[PDB]
Each structure stands twice: as C-alpha cells, then as structure tokens.
Symmetry: D2
Subunit: 390 residues, 4 copies
Amino acid sequence: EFDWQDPLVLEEQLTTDEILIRDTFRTYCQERLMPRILLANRNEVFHREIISEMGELGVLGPTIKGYGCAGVSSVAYGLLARELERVDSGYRSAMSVQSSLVMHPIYAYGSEEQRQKYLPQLAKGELLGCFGLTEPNSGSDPSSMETRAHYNSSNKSYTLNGTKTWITNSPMADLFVVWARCEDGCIRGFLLEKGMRGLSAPRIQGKFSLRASATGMIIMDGVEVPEENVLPGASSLGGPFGCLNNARYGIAWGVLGASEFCLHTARQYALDRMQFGVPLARNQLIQKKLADMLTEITLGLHACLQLGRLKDQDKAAPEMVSLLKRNNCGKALDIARQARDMLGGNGISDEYHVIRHAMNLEAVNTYDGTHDIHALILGRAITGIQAFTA
Amino acid sequence: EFDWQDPLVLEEQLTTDEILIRDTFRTYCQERLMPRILLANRNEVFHREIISEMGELGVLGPTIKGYGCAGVSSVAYGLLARELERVDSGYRSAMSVQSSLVMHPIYAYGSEEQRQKYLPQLAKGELLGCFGLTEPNSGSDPSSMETRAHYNSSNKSYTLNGTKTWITNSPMADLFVVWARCEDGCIRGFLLEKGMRGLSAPRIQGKFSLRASATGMIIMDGVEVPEENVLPGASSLGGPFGCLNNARYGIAWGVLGASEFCLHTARQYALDRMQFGVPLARNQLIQKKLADMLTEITLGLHACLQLGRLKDQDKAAPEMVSLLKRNNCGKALDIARQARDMLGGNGISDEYHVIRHAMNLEAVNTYDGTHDIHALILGRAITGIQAFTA
Amino acid sequence: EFDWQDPLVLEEQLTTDEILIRDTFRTYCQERLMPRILLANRNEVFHREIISEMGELGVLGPTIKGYGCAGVSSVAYGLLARELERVDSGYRSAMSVQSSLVMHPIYAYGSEEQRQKYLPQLAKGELLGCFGLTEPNSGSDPSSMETRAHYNSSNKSYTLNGTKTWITNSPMADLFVVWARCEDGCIRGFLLEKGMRGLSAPRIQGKFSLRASATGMIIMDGVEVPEENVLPGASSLGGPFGCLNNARYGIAWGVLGASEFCLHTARQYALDRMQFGVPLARNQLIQKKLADMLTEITLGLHACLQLGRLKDQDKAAPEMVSLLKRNNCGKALDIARQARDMLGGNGISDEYHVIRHAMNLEAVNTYDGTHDIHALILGRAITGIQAFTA
Amino acid sequence: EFDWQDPLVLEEQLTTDEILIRDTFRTYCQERLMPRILLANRNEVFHREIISEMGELGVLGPTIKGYGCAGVSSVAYGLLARELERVDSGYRSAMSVQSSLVMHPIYAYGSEEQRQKYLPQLAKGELLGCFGLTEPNSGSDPSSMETRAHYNSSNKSYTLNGTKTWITNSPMADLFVVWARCEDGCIRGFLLEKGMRGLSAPRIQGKFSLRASATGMIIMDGVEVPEENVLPGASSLGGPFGCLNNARYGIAWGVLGASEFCLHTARQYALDRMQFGVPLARNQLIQKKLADMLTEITLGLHACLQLGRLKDQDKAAPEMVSLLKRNNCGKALDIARQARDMLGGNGISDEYHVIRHAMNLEAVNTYDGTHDIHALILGRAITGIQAFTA
Ligand SMILES: Cc1cc2nc3c(=O)[nH]c(=O)nc-3n(C[C@H](O)[C@H](O)[C@H](O)COP(=O)(O)OP(=O)(O)OC[C@H]3O[C@@H](n4cnc5c(N)ncnc54)[C@H](O)[C@@H]3O)c2cc1C
Ligand SMILES: Cc1cc2nc3c(=O)[nH]c(=O)nc-3n(C[C@H](O)[C@H](O)[C@H](O)COP(=O)(O)OP(=O)(O)OC[C@H]3O[C@@H](n4cnc5c(N)ncnc54)[C@H](O)[C@@H]3O)c2cc1C
Ligand SMILES: Cc1cc2nc3c(=O)[nH]c(=O)nc-3n(C[C@H](O)[C@H](O)[C@H](O)COP(=O)(O)OP(=O)(O)OC[C@H]3O[C@@H](n4cnc5c(N)ncnc54)[C@H](O)[C@@H]3O)c2cc1C
Ligand SMILES: Cc1cc2nc3c(=O)[nH]c(=O)nc-3n(C[C@H](O)[C@H](O)[C@H](O)COP(=O)(O)OP(=O)(O)OC[C@H]3O[C@@H](n4cnc5c(N)ncnc54)[C@H](O)[C@@H]3O)c2cc1C
Ligand SMILES: O=C(O)CCC[N+](=O)[O-]
Ligand SMILES: O=C(O)CCC[N+](=O)[O-]
Ligand SMILES: O=C(O)CCC[N+](=O)[O-]
Ligand SMILES: O=C(O)CCC[N+](=O)[O-]
C-alpha cells in the first residue's frame, strides 16, 4: 500500500478544485510545453505565445480576486508552479514574474485606475511584463541601487536614470515595473511601457542556465514617467520585498517538480539500463541515492502544503518562505546533480533532460535571495542579531 | 509574527487534548526527569520507579483502547515521545519498549486471556518488560536468529535455547517477549517471566550511549514455557516487524525533541557567550548552523504530524515510517554534533548536556533498523528490486 | 611567508626542466588557448589545429622515449595536463586521448612496424586519433561489449561489426584504436584509418559538458582490417585497462587546474565585488568557502606529485590512480559549483567561465571510471571481496 | 602490488631512524599503553607514570637539541604522535602539552638558567607540566584574558590573579606555564611551581571526551612569582601563538593514527561479521565507506609528511599548520563516526574502542583553534581581509 510517487498521501490534502486545476495544467504542460523544450533550451528561445496560452487557461495571477483572475488558492498556485517547473524552470520563471512580480504589486500597490488598466491584459497574457530591481552594483543589497527618480514639479512627472541587469523577460516586455530611489529617500515603484523614449532593453548572451527564458537589462536614459504611473501603495523597500516573498512561495513549490522529474527519470533509467548483466537499479549504491532524493522531495512537499494553507489564512511570515525557498532550492540542486551522475555519459546530453535541470536550478538557488542570504535572514529572526554586515 | 520556536505553526494542527497531554507530560518531564538525568547518565543508573511514575500518568501504551490504557491518538503518542526524548533518549527508549514492543504485541497478537492478565500491570507500570529479538549473530537480518523453540507434546510446552543481546530493560524486567524459530519453520513469540529456571539476564557494561537506560541480555538455558504463553496471533517475522514499525513511529517523533533541546541550548549559549567583544550569535558562521538546525527540525515535525494522522486512519505503511525514522535520526545526529561544536570546550561536558545527546542518538540511528538498512527498504519499495543481498 | 597560491611549496619539489616545461606551456595556453575558448565552448567548436600547435611544442605523448617524443617525466606530464585543464577540460581531454589512449597503447602494445609508422605523425599532431571502447550497451562493464571481430583465414584479416558511442575526437579522427571481442574470447585492439569502407563516425549533438571538444561515435559495418593492424601486444581487457590507468593519471592532475582557476576567479571576484558597502571577501561565509577550496586543491596536488614520482619508478598501482582520479574529480566538482555560487547571477554566464568548468567536470567525474566505480575498485583492493555484482 | 595499508608508499619517504623510532614507540604503545586504556578511559584515570615511561624512551621534547632531548626530526615527532594517538588522543595530548607547550616555550623563550634548570627534568618526565592560556571568558579570543600580573618594584616579583580553565594535566602538574596580561600591556609567560601559596588546581568532572587524560583549572589568588620565573623571550601573544603552532603540528599527525585505528577496526569487523549469510564487507554501501576513510587518511599523511620536511628547513608557516590541523581533525571525526556506525550495536561499546575515538576527536577538533577559527585564519591569509569580527 506504499506509493513511492506520493509517500505520505499529499493527494488527500488537496481539494477537488486544486486537484482538477493541477491535472488540467499538467495536460497543457505535457502536451504543449514538453514537446518544445528540447530546442527552446538548446537555442535560447522563448516562445512569447507561451504566455498567451497560459493566458487562456487563466493561470497568470491566479490568486488575485477579480480583474479577470481566477482567485484560486495559494496551494493551487504552488501546484501550478510545480507542474510548470516539472517541465523547465525558465518557463516557470516567466510565469512567476508575470504573476507575483508584475501583477501582484500592481494589484496591491497600485491605484484602482492602474489595476483596471493593466491587470486584465496581464491575465489574458496580452501584456508580458517584468520586475526590474537588481542592478549591476546592487544584488543582495538593494539599499545600494543607483537608479534615481527626480521630480518635475512643472510637468507632474519623474525622470529616471539607471541600469537594471539580469531582468527576466525584459527583452520582450511591454510593461516594466521599475524600482528607483527618490529624492525623499524612500524607494518607489514606477510603471514603464515599451516605446518610451530613453528606455532600451538589450538581451544578455552566453547564459548556461534558464536558456529557454529571455533575460535582458533595463537601461533608462532620462525616461520621463507621468505621476499616474507611480505605484501609490509602496513608499519603500517593502514594495519589492512584499512581492518578493510572494515569488519565493512559488519557487518553493516549483523546484519540487524539477526534482520529481529528475527522480522519475533516474528511477526509470536505473530499471531500464543494465550493466554487469543486471539493471542498475539492483545496486545498493544506486538505491540509496533514490532513497535520499525521494526523502527530501517528500519533506519539502508537505512543508509547502502547510505554508500554502497558512498563507490563505494570512498567517504566513517572510521567514517561513525564506525557509522553504532556501531549503527546497538547495535540495533540488543536489537531486539534479545526483540524477545527472546516475545516467552516466547520457546524463550530459540535453536529450536526457536532467542536465537542463541541474543547470536551471543553478540560477534558482541564486535569484530571489541567494542561499546564504536566506540563511542570515533566518538567523536574524532566530537570534535577533543582524549578521549581514559589520 | 515569526516564531523561531514553531516556524510553521504546528500548534494550530493539534487538538486541545493533544495539547493538554503534551504540556501535562512536559511538566512531569522537566520537574521529575531533568533534575535526575545528569547523574543517572554519568553513573549508568536507571530509576525503575520512573516507569511507575509514567504508569500513574497513564503514558504507557497510550493508544491501546481499554485494559486501562488512554486510547489516545498517534500524534499524542509522538508528542509524548518528543517530550521524553527532549530529556534523554534512554528514558524515551524505556517507555518505547514498554509501549510499542511489549504491550502492543500482546494486545494485538495475544489471546484475550493474555491481554487481561498483562496489559493492566504494564499500563500501571507494575510490570517492566522488554523486547528480545536481536542476537549476537543476528542483527539486521533476523531470518538468521539461532534461538530455537522445541515442542513437548507430552507436557504441552516449548523449550527455548538461545541468547539475545543488546536487549533494553532486560536486566530489570519482569516480563520478556522473546521471539524464537520453531520446528514448523515460522518464528513465534513467547512470553517469559523472571524467575523461570533457565532464564538469566546479565547486564552490559561500558556503554557510551544511552547510559541512563538499562541494557542486558537474555540467556535461555532450556527455559520451559507453557503453551498458554505463546503469542497465538503472530506466526512469523511479521509479529516483530508489525510491532517494530509502531516503535519506529515513536522514534521519528522522539529524536526531534532531542534536536530541539540541542538547538535551544546552542541558541542561548550563542547569545550568552561572548568572544571578540560580542556575542557568538553575531557571527555568520554561527547563524548558518542555527539556520540549518531549525530547518531540518521543522521539516521533520510536519512530516511526523502528517504520518500521525494517516496512522489513525490506518493508512500508514511500513515504508512511510522507515522514511521518517531514517531521516529524523540522521538529521538529529548532525544537529547534536553541531550543537556540541558551538559550545566549544564546554561542549564536551555532560553538565552542558549536548554531549549526552550526541552520544545517545548514536544508538538511536543504529537500532530499530540501521540508517543504510532503511535506505534499502525504501529502495526496494521504489524500484521493486531487492538490494539487501546477492 | 605564506603563499595562498602554493601553500606547501610544491615548487621546491619540481625539477628545473619540469618547471620550464610548465611555464612554457602555460604561455602557449594563456596566449593561444584562453582567447579562443569563450566561443569554442559557446558554439561547440573544436579547432583541429590546436592539436598541430601542441604537436610543435612536442606535448603529445611526452613520456614516450624516442619516435620523436619528449620522453619527459610523469610529473611533467601531470603539470602539462594541469595547465591545459586550467583552460578547459575538453581541450585537455583531446590531448589526453592522443597521448594516453592512442599513442601509449600503440607504443606499448604494437609491433615495431606499427610504432615506426604511427608514433611520429601522432607526436607531430598530423594524425588526430581516438580511443573506441565504450558502447551503447557497455559502459562501466566492458566485458559486455558487442563489437565482434571475425577472422578471414583466406584474406589474412578480421571483419569488425559494432557501435562505439561517446568517443572523443572520433568525428575528426584519422586513426581509430578500436577494441573488439574475438572468436578466441580474448578482446583485442584494432587500428582503423578513416576512409575504410564500412567505417563512419557521426557526431553527437546537445552536449552540455565538454562542448569545445568533438565527440562522436564509431560505426563499423563489416569494416575489414588487415592482420598487420591488430595490436600484437594486448590479448585481453588489460590492453585498454593498462592504458586507461595512464589516462586517469593525467586526469588526476588535470582537474586540479580547473579548480585552481575557479578558486582564483572567486577570490578576485570576492575582493572586487562589493555589497552592503564592503567587498564580499569580508564575510565569514565567503572566507570558509575559499578556505575549503584551497585545502582540497593542496591535498590533491601533493598527492599527485607523489604518485608522479612512484610512477617513474614503476611503483604505481592501478588502485593508487583510481584513488586520486576518484578523489580529485569529486572535489573539483564541488569547488566549481561553489565558485559558481559565489559569483551570483554573473556566475551563470560563460563570460565568467566558472559555469563552463562546473559543466565540464560533470563529464570528467563520469568518464574513465565513474565515481562510485572507482570506489568499488578501492573496496575490492581493501577487503579482497568483489562488490560490483551479485 | 597495492597495499591498502600504505597506498602511496609513505615508507620510502622516511629515514631509517624515523622508521626505527616509529616502530620502537609502536611497541611501547601497543605493549604498555593499549592494555591499559579500556579502564583508564572508563574510569577517568591518568597513570602519571605513563609520562615517566615516555621519559625513559626520550620521546618528550624530541626535537629540542641538547638538554637531554633527542633532537630528532619534525617528521619523527609527527610519527611519534601518530602512534600515541593510534592508542588514545588523551594520551597523545598529555605528551603534546609536555613537548610543545611546556618544554618548547621554555627552550625558546627562556633564559639559559631556566632551560638548564627545567628542560632536563621535563625530558626525563620527572616534571609533569601544563600550558595555561585559556580562561572561562577567553577561548578563541586570547586578547580578552583577565589574568593580570602586577609588579612589585620592592620585592622584584609579580603578583598574578586569574583563573585558567580546561587546562590539560593541571591537576597533577609540577610546573605551570601561565600567560597573563601585564601593566605594560604586553602579555607575558610566567613559570609556576606547585606548592606556591595562592595556586590551586582543581579537576574538572563529567568529561565525555579525553577521559584518560587529566584536565583541571589553574586558580591564582595573588600568587607571587619571582622575576627569574618570567619568560624573558616572549613579550606578547606570539609566545603562546609560536608554541601553539608547534602543538598543532603534532595534532595534524596525531588524529591520523586514530583514524587508521578506526579504519583497521571497521575493515576487520566487516570481514569478520556476517549478516544475510555473507560478510558485511561484501556490500557496496560498506565498501564506499572504507573507500572514503582510506582516501582522506592518505591525503592527510602525505601532506603532513611534506610539512614535516618544510618545518625542519624553517619554511613552515602558521597557516600551513592551520590548514592541516583544521583539515585532519575534521576528516578524523567523520571517519570515527562512520566506523562507529559500521559496527552497529557493538559500536556503542568502549570494548570496541571506536566510540572512544569518536568522543576524543570531539575535543581535538575544538581545542588549539576551533574548526571555523582555522578557517578564518586561512581566509585572512588568502583574501588579506580580517573576518573574525566587525
Ligand atoms: C536567469 C536569471 C534571471 C533573473 N531575473 C531577475 C528579474 O526578473 N528581476 C530582478 O530584479 N532580478 C533578477 N535576477 C538577479 C537576482 O535577483 C540577483 O542575482 C540576486 O538578488 C543577487 O545576487 P547577485 O547576482 O547580485 O550577486 P551578489 O549579491 O553579489 O552575491 C554573490 C554571492 O555572494 C554572496 N553574498 C552576497 N552578499 C553577502 C553577505 N552580506 N554575506 C555573505 N555572502 C553574501 C551570495 O550568497 C552569492 O553566493 C536574475 C538572475 C538569473 C541568474
Ligand atoms: C542502547 C541500545 C539498545 C538496544 N535495545 C534493543 C532491544 O530492546 N530489543 C532488540 O531486539 N534489540 C535491541 N538492540 C539492537 C538493535 O536492534 C540492533 O543493533 C540492530 O537491529 C542491528 O544491528 P547490529 O548491532 O546487529 O549490527 P549489524 O546488523 O551487524 O550491522 C552493522 C552495520 O552494518 C550495516 N549493515 C548490515 N547489514 C547490511 C547489508 N545487508 N547491506 C549494507 N549494510 C549493512 C549497518 O547499516 C550497520 O552500519 C539495541 C542496541 C543499542 C545500541
Ligand atoms: C565528453 C565525454 C567524452 C567521452 N569520451 C570517450 C572516449 O574517447 N573513449 C571511450 O571509450 N569512452 C568515452 N566516454 C564514455 C565513458 O568512458 C563512459 O561514460 C564510462 O566508462 C561509463 O559510463 P556510462 O556512460 O556507460 O554509464 P554507466 O556505466 O551505465 O553508469 C551509469 C551510472 O551508474 C553507475 N554504475 C554503473 N555500474 C554500476 C555498478 N555495478 N554498481 C553501482 N553503480 C554503478 C555509475 O556510477 C554511474 O553513476 C565519454 C563520455 C563523455 C560524457
Ligand atoms: C580535553 C580538553 C583539553 C584542553 N586543554 C587545554 C590546555 O592544556 N591549555 C589551554 O590553554 N587550553 C586548553 N583547552 C581549551 C581550548 O584551548 C579552548 O576550548 C579553545 O581555544 C577555544 O574554545 P572555547 O572552549 O573557549 O570556546 P569558544 O571560543 O567560545 O568557541 C565556541 C564555538 O564558537 C565558535 N567561535 C568562536 N569565536 C568565533 C568567531 N569569532 N566567528 C565564528 N565562530 C566563532 C567556535 O568555532 C566554536 O564552535 C582544552 C579543551 C578540552 C575540551
Ligand atoms: O530576483 C528577483 O527579484 C525575482 C525573480 C523571480 N523569478 O522567478 O525570476
Ligand atoms: O531494535 C529493536 O528491536 C527496537 C528498539 C526500540 N527501542 O526504543 O529501544
Ligand atoms: O573513458 C575512457 O575510456 C577514457 C577517456 C579519456 N579522456 O580524457 O577523454
Ligand atoms: O589549546 C591549547 O592551548 C593547546 C592544547 C594542546 N593539547 O594537545 O592539549
């Protein structure tokens, strides 16, 4: 009565909707995404339409209520990210930006006029957006960004100058949610649209992680923004940090799908591939690896489930999320690399996919709070002493 | 709103009874057990009465229904083991034998007459019992034991010959649940009482793990047992293996309390102890360790909770238990050793307790299924191929 | 007086020639190789001429005496592989095949006529060769290959049928050293030249490890070979296994250069990159990583040195080599991945090179004896019991 | 031709004297020490005479030239510590204090009159000494000690006040080398003899690491010391730090013997113990562990050898020593704990010794520079930035 696929029966913890939604999306993902990832990753190609398709399914901004969004549960959101990542992290990352970094902040930090004007086209996937916070000289420490926003008392607008780098989707984005430091001192969020004079978004080359995903920069040469494009609901670092957490949530769930995919591939291979006369799966050294992969996946899953619930009850704290994101991203990296080892030579071929996952999770464990950073966050919360600096 | 003590709010997952019970026992444990462990461990002493006290609280065999037992939930059982281990593994191990290895098998594999005759005195703690399965030449492989049970057609009894070693409580036990291989081939369970001619239970010396716990052997020199002392409900290896799992459950929860105790001690020490002018807790190297300890504890807890539930629904499988026991025992070992490192020189003094825990969890990760064994169990269940032998 | 670059003074252990040679090659490597690896790796390109250049330097088959080879020391050989790998593993792998897998076997297992005819053009780099042993269904277990070699009593030749896969250089090779199982039972080595009817060497696509290196297969459709092309000095698995060890030697040294390159890049970056107002190198979490990288590199180096010496004294045993190859490849993998983490986002860009190394060492730890395999080899030698099968 | 006992042939790197000395001592150690460690450790007993015996062999202060000392090589010193630790770390620790912490500083920082007066009785083992630096509030940071030494212009002496804790041998010491902070600011070294009014050396209880070794404190209640008892050759923290390094050297070698002992015990046990019908040594999971133990031991050995040489050439730097001490102590801890796991239940019995080693190396990795501390030392030397504080 044991099911290595769902050891602790996560299924009897989901609601029939959550279940339907999961399955439904898994069908889109396997049928429409999987058949197009081998080359999308090999030749660094992001199929814009992918967003549009997700737009019809109504998977973009699924937790938001109204404005054409599903208004589904956090768990369902996690389940969704898990199916998407089971295919490719780059893909899930596009969806993540759109959902938690572009929509959610507009929805919770914007004026009603902003929401009305944008949320709908975002949900439909007519507007591909991006979250521009990171800078060449500001990564783990945002209180160090250089993008400044000056105010034109006369014209009723701000003028932004700065460079954002490593920004997902930026290259083929229509709406840009840029964060700059103002004259008052507080950093705010500005909404930018492509076509604005001064705004250019070159693409980054030589990526060897998240290749199926478009990544570029945001260069602003005196880009004039109207007052009505300022996010009226976020006067400081909490704007991005509030959203950031919503993103980390999706990531905690996500990486678990990539792990499960590596697990299932290794397990099969071990049964299918024979050496020394028998199937690899018959060796102790092979079984322990599978034992450990499954164990960490399971532990993560049920943790994620729990958090999903607490979230919907508005009882989720930033640190809780740091904990699962930090944990799940590290474990998912080992699992990938282990899987890669078990497939031997074949393992280094993208045609066996595992290599793609190892590579992708390399960035996932780096972005949205490096591994060690999340450790310090947890340590601050546990000891009460700050350990990020001197 | 983050509580490093209960990151994911395990509390809102417990029932008011489970909570009361927990607290209630924690009071007995802190008030009656803690003040007596420093020396009990230093001088290898097991305070028999400890059982009697637990007998009044009705903590022995808490899940059994009737026969004077609480008939409480599996979760409450786990919570109980967690509070006991938070003090000392040896202590929790005594309680574990009594509960899951002596009572549970009698209750589920005995005749009604056996239950009526024994369960009550066990629950009251008037009868200290022990589980004798392991032998000098049979540890991980029980299908290799040498204790044989011959049948006396004439006298209506069996004659047992064999040696069981490393048996918890045996030295001061009144009832012995011994498993021997019969003539039919199937191995059965025999009930032995002290005083039987032929039965001797010397004690083992030189233990440097689980010292506060009594450990001895079971030597049987033609010990004649009446037919009515044979466990009529277990015709083979499933008798011990069925019970074994119930024991592993308690252990999965247990080790988590020992970890939490090490965590809380290190955290404090790090805040209290200063070096280089500041509190140790101010260093990154110290914070990451605390970060990791807390993370593994939390993951385990919520997993254990889940299993506790599935158990009461009769949906718990042996492998599920192997998974948590294997996982939790390993993580709890690292956590101990880490804690020990963080207290520096003091860390090697039993007066700081951590050393005691590192030592104790050394046996916990070894007994009731070594770490690698549980790995093979999981691998068999995952690949479908046996990897214990050639 | 401490030099983090050479902690234990490996320098005062080298001979002035070994030193000259090292430096000399390091100049070719930095000047001629480094400036061409960013794209060679990005677009999977192997600059054939690279061999020719190494041919002029006389670095191909450096230990062989006569036939136009340097006849230098094993240490110098290791030093050479270390400088080459400091650039790219793919590059060093090309040189490795040529040296230890194509030349050495011809030199030690061939007739004089074979040596005279081939060694010279190989050393000059006029003949690019490859070692074909691995098969689609034979990887860790060679006693399972399917390439059969039948004998033509009439024509005085053999006919080979089989497929070799994952063969380095095969795509642009002139000489092929193929191993096939004969009718007698013993497996022998056959020399094949491009142009032979029946022999085709397609290339493998989708590599995401050792991209700057050409990898293809060896398909033989009744490829007729003259008796004079059979390696008269190797009647069984010891032919490849004898050479294999000579290859592993070079690899033990090699991976150490890739590690040092990752170390030097991280160290600099940590000093150059600032966050939170100071240089990353000022954080404890960053320093420990650097501490560990350096420690493992050093340990490996001096071990390699020692073995190099024992080798020249003909006192090197297969297991010694397994030990360093196994050890060094694993440690060099962690070091890469760590380095990659420390460079954050940039770390995922090939323009920062570390990513290339992590990827490359993924194959190095897989080929020429997987990590776990070398473990079993060591275990056999230590316990005297074979543990590869049932 | 492979010898798992000496993989890389360390033997052909030793001089016939070094070899004789090694063997000679190994005979004393096996014949006189081993038969007395089971109980010495069980009942916390230090056989004072042990020093006297080592005194006759002339093993105390072996590198010092003259004054009745051997004046042997650093390598021979390491070899000596390795044989001693192969028995018990506590034992080797006694010898270490005597040699590197009591004698060496007197010899290199004392006046000739001091050397003449003490070195001889120390070498003979007539004077058991101890190194008192650590304090209750000063462990990793010595620049924080509280023992002050005031000067009596009138009497020509100093008055010391302070407490030193965790001091090896102190309980049965005749000579005390105490370090206190003077009025000038510089910390100096004072020589104290038992019987001095004001000086008391109680013993510490509850040790569960290095039990066979005596450990106590040094309480000084206005202990008046003559000017002639001040170490004229050490005006600051470099006095202890200079000696400290000489101690770490011995430790780097030492822990390697304890590892080898655990390795040899596990290997045998694995061959001797059978489960599932065969010897444990026949399982892959068991072989990999042995593979890893041997690998780390070997790497350490040859590193230690090298350093030994550089030392005698006066080319050893503090960081080199930190590197091996840090490395070897950590690896020797894993090896112990692994060994302990492999012996299952028996493993928790001191009669199988491994448990004793795991426990002992717990303190070794803590004293003379914690693991993380040595990491920061290395990081300072590598980046040039101090990371011990804010
Ligand atoms: C595929 C990909 C897509 C991305 N998409 C986006 C996007 O859409 N929007 C956006 O805003 N950003 C994006 N980023 C960038 C990401 O948010 C930043 O990489 C991350 O917040 C910070 O790291 P960094 O690259 O600046 O490196 P750093 O901050 O310089 O850190 C480098 C290393 O130093 C360590 N470190 C840093 N500070 C400390 C400290 N105080 N103590 C100890 N260790 C420290 C880290 O743990 C890490 O190992 C993306 C990156 C990748 C790789
Ligand atoms: C404090 C303490 C109390 C105990 N109390 C009891 C009690 O009350 N009742 C009772 O019945 N027993 C008891 N035991 C013993 C316990 O149940 C046995 O130790 C355990 O089932 C088996 O291990 P073993 O000691 O026989 O060693 P082994 O079975 O010999 O195993 C030794 C090592 O070998 C490994 N190993 C074994 N087989 C294999 C394989 N096929 N493949 C790969 N690795 C393998 C293990 O992982 C372990 O590291 C106790 C032990 C301690 C230490
Ligand atoms: C870039 C690159 C270049 C190469 N170039 C060459 C070349 O020039 N010439 C040539 O002959 N070959 C070459 N190879 C292939 C290499 O020699 C083989 O990959 C290697 O010997 C065996 O692994 P495999 O790929 O067949 O996988 P497998 O043998 O199937 O092994 C797969 C996994 O199973 C494990 N495994 C296998 N058997 C056991 C067992 N009994 N017990 C426990 N675990 C086991 C391994 O540890 C590994 O993790 C190359 C590979 C790469 C990736
Ligand atoms: C059996 C035994 C014998 C001993 N014998 C002697 C003797 O003969 N003579 C003598 O002088 N001393 C002796 N000592 C003590 C030893 O020298 C000290 O334990 C050691 O120098 C320092 O640690 P501590 O105990 O004070 O703990 P601490 O210095 O308080 O350190 C505790 C923990 O904190 C960490 N830590 C400390 N500072 C930092 C920092 N800045 N950043 C990050 N982590 C940090 C450490 O890594 C360790 O894990 C002995 C100890 C034992 C256990
Ligand atoms: O780093 C960030 O600011 C968030 C990235 C979210 N994502 O999935 O790309
Ligand atoms: O090994 C066994 O058979 C069970 C031990 C249970 N316990 O807690 O001592
Ligand atoms: O696997 C092999 O047979 C050897 C590979 C050598 N190399 O460096 O590519
Ligand atoms: O910590 C110290 O000051 C040195 C200890 C040396 N030793 O072997 O006990």
